[PDB]
Amino acid sequence: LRNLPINQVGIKDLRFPITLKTAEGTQSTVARLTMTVYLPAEQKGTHMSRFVALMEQHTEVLDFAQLHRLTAEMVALLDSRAGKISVSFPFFRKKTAPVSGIRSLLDYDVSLTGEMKDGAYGHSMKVMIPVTSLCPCSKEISQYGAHNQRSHVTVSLTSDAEVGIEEVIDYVETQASCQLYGLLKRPDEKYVTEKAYENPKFVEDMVRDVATSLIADKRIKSFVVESENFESIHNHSAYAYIAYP
Amino acid sequence: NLPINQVGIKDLRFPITLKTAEGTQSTVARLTMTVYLPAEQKGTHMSRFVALMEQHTEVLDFAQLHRLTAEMVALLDSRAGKISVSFPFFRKKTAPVSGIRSLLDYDVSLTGEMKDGAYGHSMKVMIPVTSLCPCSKEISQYGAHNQRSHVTVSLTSDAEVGIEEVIDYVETQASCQLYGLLKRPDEKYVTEKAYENPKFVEDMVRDVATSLIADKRIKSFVVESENFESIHNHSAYAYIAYP
């Protein structure tokens, strides 16, 4: 009676090397894990070492099928009816400069979550995409130039069928004033400077353009789109978010 | 054409004066200030959030947060919006043997929210405590591993719950609470007290949540605890949400 069920208990911020397979290829990265299970009112404690045992023994490449298997195996190993695994890591993608064709990596921040509830599995994801934002107000009121800055666009979603990390990346980067590259030659820098100027967007415009795409995707049951613009003229950020439905 | 749930400014740093039941203090806040944006409206008016903060010189407390949130949604011409303010919060404590006084620091957020002329508020408090392991003590012939823990309480009520109240709910339940200033007899007392009161992370979250369930001002809450286990390089963690 005095006793209460605990929504989630286990371990948090275990750092662990992982290999990840997505549609575009396989890559090695380093993750932080939070691994937890439901604890019924009657049980005193969970078994904390079994969460680490699980990661040490499962050597398969991570993908959405493997995260499912892993979460199902965890709840079984932990003797629980419910649990979550959240895995956060940097994610690299090969990019090509818009004029030179010179290739370089860009880095994104990703989290993947698997959740079991009484035999039912659900999965969600989050991706932070760094883009260039350029202010339409600045350009319009100014006889020359326009302020611009890096922005972090964060998409969180839950879907029934799998949605690829790269697909979330493309939905955002398609919409940005201009996207980022690690390696830019002189013509590419001329290209990005001009495109961003040509395509100014408020933080409001950015969240709306991405949200439109996500609403259209039949896989997506709910989402949040945030955008944060590190305003180059202020020392605080412009911020917006849309949650759906 | 889509409405935007919230749009405005994030992580504006700003000095504030804060009034609570035990007194007034000066601290430094981060603010996030946002309003609802209707489907066909192009943008909000970003400079007005800063203007509002620059103009209002009054001490912060729950009544002044309400007033600032009202005035914001008015000034921005919106039907809804939210103000969240985060800051370090200091409280004077008394060492348990010497009685020598010293401050402790806690992390607090308060949030006010207007939706179509109705107001709601909520708060969050991170209280650092000592945790000590019952399995370690029971299995070992001497000693018990122990570590700092960060206990985070988020709650929503209608009547005001004081920051100090949330702190007390938690410190009362910890294996032992923290102090900045401890003499040798104080160190002895805290060492023994934690060792006499071992708690798993499970125990800590159940013990705090029971106290909050008993407080009938509280509509809903989350209690989390993260224990920086001194024998691992990762943490034990738990949370309860209610209802």
Next chain:
Amino acid sequence: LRNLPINQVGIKDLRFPITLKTAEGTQSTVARLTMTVYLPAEQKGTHMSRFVALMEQHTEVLDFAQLHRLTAEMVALLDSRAGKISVSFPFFRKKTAPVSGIRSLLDYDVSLTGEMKDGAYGHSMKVMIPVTSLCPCSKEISQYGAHNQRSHVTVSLTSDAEVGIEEVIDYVETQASCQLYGLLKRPDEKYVTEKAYENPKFVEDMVRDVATSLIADKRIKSFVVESENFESIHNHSAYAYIAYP
């Protein structure tokens, strides 16, 4: 013999409310402190609670005279021949918008250090100043627009006579493509957009212009100037620093 002196021992990241007085006025802020003393080979340990005792008992406003007194009192209280107090905090200054005249605060990050060595006192400081940087290459090669971004300029210095926090701020902000304001009306935004465009500067130009000023100041015995530009076109930073002499 087996025993070794310890350069510095004490406490680190004590968070503590402070009141600070500089040339422009007095303000309340929150600091992190690191307070340490020298430990001779022969002594087993220092007295850790006395560092907190010291902060709890000294209720005077902080300024360079008070940091001196505080460091001298610490080494005496700790029974040591040498020690350091480092105090880090956000620092607010009142600013005025360049067209409207509308006033707002801006926030800077500051550290002040006091050091005793056998009766001799020395003090140093560091200030991070967030500014706008605008790329000359971008503007010159582009038919319109120029990429720009927040930059953090960090000045560290040691001096014999006191150098005010605001003076370090002015040395940097005087040199920037354009400086930041919290509150900007439409004409002010037109003003800052244009000024930054009119005054493009590489990270190299920025460190050089600030360093020139610091070399000229007779108070300053040594310094480091760093600048980091959060390139709005990349996901890494452009960075430079000058150390002198």
Next chain:
Amino acid sequence: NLPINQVGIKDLRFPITLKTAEGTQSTVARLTMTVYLPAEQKGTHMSRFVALMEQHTEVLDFAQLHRLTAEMVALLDSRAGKISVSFPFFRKKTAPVSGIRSLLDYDVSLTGEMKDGAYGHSMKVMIPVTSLCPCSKEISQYGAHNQRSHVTVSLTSDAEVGIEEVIDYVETQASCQLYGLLKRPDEKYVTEKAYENPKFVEDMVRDVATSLIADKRIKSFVVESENFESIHNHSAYAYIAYP
């Protein structure tokens, strides 16, 4: 007209493969890559630092760092420059009773530096350990407060000192070292061992520094330890520099 000590790129994130004495692993690095800039030269050539990393596919180790730093100062047409690479580093450990194996994570930086055709290298390793308080144990009738500690070793040598070597120097000296995976008999062993080997932060830094002084490959070093005291909300800290 002023020369600039170092100019280039900072916190480029980049996946790397790392080879050490115990094996090869894949990790993710932050890089800072800079060159000296002569007084009358206007700017460096920023895109070339990224090109250099994109082109060189070789496994990282001390010989490859030297080679990358040589090639950089060549490609940038500078007389001096520095490459620093920071990453999490994993090592497989054996629990002290069960022998069950599990990884532990450490934070590493390696730095290479060219000055007028001469090369130097240096390294930094943060090793997390358990610390346990001798005063707490001595004064208390039972128990002893203990906590995670972050021990950071920075060193410069000419002959290569392995990352695992620095880790061993430190773990050997801690009240007890950390493991990710511990069974009940392992938890008992580590609890007792720390309690049998209490050390102040002073003790830890002297004990490590003595080991490093004895390693005649080492030209200079700094040992710091920060102990996240489980009875306070602040840390004990010490450092030694040598010579």
